[PDB]
Amino acid sequence: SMNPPPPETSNPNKPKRETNQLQYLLRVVLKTLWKHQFAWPFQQPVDAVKLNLPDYYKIIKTPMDMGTIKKRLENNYYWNAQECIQDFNTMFTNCYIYNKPGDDIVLMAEALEKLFLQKINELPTEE
Ligand SMILES: CCNS(=O)(=O)c1ccc2c(c1)CN(C)C(=O)N2
Ligand SMILES: [K+]
């Protein structure tokens, strides 16, 4: 029932780059999903205490959330776009694993994922 330390949002020894694709991921993809009406449950790490989900971190061992992704993008944490896309995919996957199909949180994840994929379809070529 207690929360782990959140995922790191910086790591000085980790390698990183600024790419036009990562800029797009912050300016377009994250920004669009962040403002969505269903973004709120995904804007911070799952709080197992507040939300009374005492089993959450007994099941989900690779937690991820858009608050973490936002800070990673702001902090130039990533080496490439794929590392960031992976984080979004971990967040969605965790939600589908932990919750029941048709639960409100799943409908929210599914709407955010639809939008995510629409935005990723226009990801520019690396230039
Ligand atoms: C519709 C959201 N309801 S709630 O905030 O009680 C909630 C209910 C369930 C969860 C979460 C939030 C967050 N989340 C990422 C998750 O997988 N489960
Ligand atoms: K499930």
Side-chain angles (χ1 to χ4, degrees), residues 1-26 28-70 72-99 101-126:
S1 70
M2 303 156 43
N3 296 311
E8 67 183 17
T9 57
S10 61
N11 187 328
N13 284 335
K14 177 185 184 294
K16 63 261 298 178
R17 295 160 69 235
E18 249 288 55
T19 76
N20 69 314
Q21 294 184 327
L22 279 160
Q23 290 169 327
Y24 177 93
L25 280 163
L26 181 49
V28 172
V29 185
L30 184 283
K31 210 86 238 85
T32 299
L33 269 65
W34 191 265
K35 294 177 169 188
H36 193 276
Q37 62 189 313
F38 294 160
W40 60 271
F42 302 99
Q43 288 178 328
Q44 57 292 310
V46 170
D47 184 337
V49 180
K50 192 185 188 182
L51 302 176
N52 193 22
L53 304 170
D55 61 344
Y56 188 80
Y57 292 107
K58 275 77 179 52
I59 296 161
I60 296 304
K61 303 306 194 73
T62 308
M64 188 55 50
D65 67 277
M66 297 204 290
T68 299
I69 291 167
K70 182 174 183 288
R72 284 171 175 203
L73 287 161
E74 293 171 344
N75 297 355
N76 302 119
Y77 178 81
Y78 299 112
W79 177 256
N80 60 29
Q82 187 46 235
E83 292 181 341
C84 179
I85 293 161
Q86 182 57 69
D87 281 345
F88 276 99
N89 282 326
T90 300
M91 183 185 74
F92 296 129
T93 297
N94 292 342
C95 185
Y96 303 141
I97 285 165
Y98 175 75
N99 308 275
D103 281 349
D104 281 344
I105 190 65
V106 171
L107 299 175
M108 300 169 92
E110 290 176 327
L112 291 173
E113 192 182 5
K114 179 182 198 282
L115 189 48
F116 175 71
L117 292 173
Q118 289 187 312
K119 297 312 204 171
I120 284 317
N121 206 248
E122 312 312 329
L123 185 69
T125 307
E126 188 166 2

